[PDB]
Amino acid sequence: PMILGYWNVRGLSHPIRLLLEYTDSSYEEKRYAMGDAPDYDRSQWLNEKFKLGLDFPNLPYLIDGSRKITQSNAIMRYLARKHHLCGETEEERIRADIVENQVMDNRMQLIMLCYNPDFEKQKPEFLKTIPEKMKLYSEFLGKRPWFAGDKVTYVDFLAYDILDQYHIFEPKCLDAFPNLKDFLARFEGLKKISAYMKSSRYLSTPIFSKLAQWSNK
Amino acid sequence: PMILGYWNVRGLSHPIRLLLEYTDSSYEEKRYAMGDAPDYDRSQWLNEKFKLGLDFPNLPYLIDGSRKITQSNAIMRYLARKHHLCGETEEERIRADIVENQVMDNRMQLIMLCYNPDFEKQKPEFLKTIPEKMKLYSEFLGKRPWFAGDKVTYVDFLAYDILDQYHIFEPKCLDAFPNLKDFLARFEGLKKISAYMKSSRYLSTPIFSKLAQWSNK
Ligand SMILES: N[C@@H](CCC(=O)N[C@@H](CS[C@@H]1c2ccccc2-c2ccccc2[C@H]1O)C(=O)NCC(=O)O)C(=O)O
Ligand SMILES: N[C@@H](CCC(=O)N[C@@H](CS[C@@H]1c2ccccc2-c2ccccc2[C@H]1O)C(=O)NCC(=O)O)C(=O)O
């Protein structure tokens, strides 16, 4: 079957794990362990980083038969082409392209806070930027069932993940945006997703490595 | 015409500027001025950031009639689709997807150094990581004229830009990689490219905004 390599955290791999499940993919994972500090040992990964035939070794990586891919969004796009989960029209394509890039920014923003040694001090100000971020997703989605428009697409998995992560971070952040709350429930209600969420494979936390200041365990 | 909006620096907009040129796109630009330190005033942008109908306001932005796009890779992909500069096969699409994301990472690493107050002290270690990055690119391209294969695609624009930046940063960095040196010289050689580089519109440097420790003017 296919192999997905990543750390044994949620990190940025949740959309891939969820899409492998939604597509009924035949896969197994390598969940690399990282030692405790000070070292935060990575040998488990580093012993084999350059022995996998990856063009640009990284985590996550996906091996599918002959094919070897890195870069979470490239993996996501490969799986979407594979299972016909791309935007179909130019309009859907541009909406998807924008969402894909926008989620990664909002993800980088959260990461930058969560790896800041001055976390608690920076938090209040980070929390203040949430309503603005959420408002932009809320308005973009509007009354659409999915981000692209009519059909679930791979960007719905990206959006689910980052919305959920912000929701975990600040539990009241969706209260003013019922459509986003509805979107999370609609996503979570997709048959294979609901079954996966209750399964032994599910990893909702920790989101970050032991290194982080938040969701590090 | 289309309108491209971005700061009055190269930043991450280079590939876009270059693709508009290559596609003989009819466009006008809005190059937003940023104040000097210690304030680095952003009022020229900030005055109309929320007045342009962008779903997720940002720089760069591209307006093409009713269509409004943000996210530099979504801009690139819109233009790519419009001019048939995407991968044509599954193999080409995967190569282009990985390159796209890989450039952004190599770009984010350069920014991470170049905005660090400890830039000078951090430089030794950064320089040490350079050969590894260049080797990956070199090996990936291999004998192909272009990153996706036999034909130019939009990812040649992204790769050209980051390789050039690295090269500007560390001049001797491509000495070992004739293929990289050759790819730069090949890209710069494209008619529309050669012309643009000599035009009134070209802005090679500064690479970064005034807030940076390097290529900030
Ligand atoms: N843009 C690429 C980025 C690939 C990349 O940086 N990989 C990380 C793991 S991802 C990392 C992480 C490591 C542990 C815990 C959490 C994260 C994480 C979470 C959210 C978002 C970014 C991150 C990141 O902090 C890694 O450990 N790489 C193998 C190595 O360097 O040898 C992508 O989209 O795939
Ligand atoms: N993923 C998104 C990234 C959009 C984004 O962050 N935009 C920056 C300008 S781009 C910024 C930058 C600003 C000035 C000069 C250089 C850059 C730059 C250069 C290399 C790499 C990243 C950067 C970035 O640090 C900006 O000023 N935004 C409007 C604002 O906040 O009101 C994209 O790919 O398009």
The token pair at B3 is 């309108």
Are B72 and A100 inside 8 Å of each other by CB? no
Residues of B in contact with A56 (CB under 8 A): 98, 102, 136, 140
Same domain for B131 and B50 = no
Burial of A198: CB neighbours in 10 Å, binned 0-12, 13-18, 19+: exposed
Q: Sign of torsion, CA B35 B196 B20 B111?
A: negative
Same domain for B95 and B121 = yes
Give the C-alpha separation, B208 to B217, whole Å. Answer: 8
Residue A141 Cα, gap to closest chain B Cα (Å): 10
Give the C-alpha separation, B188 to B190, whole Å. Answer: 6
Same domain for A51 and A110 = no
Are A74 and B139 inside 8 Å of each other by CB? no
**DSSP code for A149:** B
Given ligand 2 and candidates B59, B61, B164, which is best to mutate, with the most ligand atoms within 8 Å of its CB? B59
Ligand 1: nearest atom to the Cα of A45:
32
Residues whose CB falls within 8 Å of the CB of residue B206, separated by 6 or more in sequence, listed in order:
B9, B10, B212, B215, B216, B217
Give the C-alpha separation, B86 to B92, whole Å. Answer: 8
Q: After which residues is chain B broken (C to N over 2.5 A)?
A: none
- Chain A residue closest to B78 (CA)? A94
A–B interface: beta-carbon pairs under 8 A: 71
Are A71 and B136 inside 8 Å of each other by CB? no
Angle in degrees, CA A117, A120, A125, rounded to 5: 110
Atom 18 in ligand 2: which residue has the minimum CA distance?
A: B11
Are A71 and B98 inside 8 Å of each other by CB? yes
What CATH number is given to the structural domain containing B110?
1.20.1050.10
Phi then psi dihedrals of residue A99, to 5 deg: -60, -50
Nearest to B187 by CA among B139, B153, B215: B153
Of A55, A78, A139, the CB nearest to B140: A55
Q: What is the resolution of this structure in A?
A: 1.8
Which range of residues forms the domain containing residue A155?
Answer: 86-190
Strand residue runs (E) in chain A: 2-7, 27-32, 61-64, 67-70
CB atoms within 10 A of CB A97: 21
Same domain for B216 and B180 = no
Same domain for B197 and B175 = no
Are B70 and A136 inside 8 Å of each other by CB? no
Q: Which residues pair with A2 in a beta bridge?
A: A27
Residues of A in contact with B71 (CB under 8 A): 97-98, 100-102, 105
Give the C-alpha separation, B77 to A98, whole Å. Answer: 10
Same domain for A11 and A69 = yes
Phi then psi dihedrals of residue A172, to 5 deg: -95, 0
The token pair at B163 is 């390789």
Same domain for B114 and B52 = no
Same domain for B151 and B62 = no
Helix axes B14-22, B154-169, angle to 10 degrees: 130
Interface test with A, best of B52, B55, B86 (most A CBs within 10 A): B55
Same domain for A107 and A127 = yes
Nearest to B199 by CA among B70, B39, B18, B76: B18
Atom 6 in ligand 2: which residue has the minimum CA distance?
A: B59
**DSSP code for B167:** H
Torsional class of B84: left (φ above 0), alpha (ψ -120 to 50), beta (otherwise): left
The 3-class SS string of B13-82 reads CHHHHHHHHHCCCCEEEEEECCCCCCCCCCHHHHCCCCCCCCCCCCCCEEEECCEEEECHHHHHHHHHHH
Same domain for A134 and A108 = yes
What CA dihedral angle connects B204, B205, B209 and B213, to 10 degrees?
140
Residues of A in contact with B98 (CB under 8 A): 55-56, 69-71, 74
The token pair at B48 is 């109309």
What CATH number is given to the structural domain containing B199?
3.40.30.10
Same domain for A52 and A22 = yes
Nearest ligand, CA of residue A110? 1
Total tally of structural domains belonging to chain A: 2
Interface test with A, best of B49, B95, B97 (most A CBs within 10 A): B97
Does any ligand 2 atom lie closer than 6 A to the CB of residue B109? no
Same domain for B62 and B21 = yes
Are A71 and B140 inside 8 Å of each other by CB? no
Helix, strand, coil in percent for chain B, rounding step 5: 50, 10, 40
- Chain A residue closest to B76 (CA)? A97
Residues of A in contact with B140 (CB under 8 A): 55-56
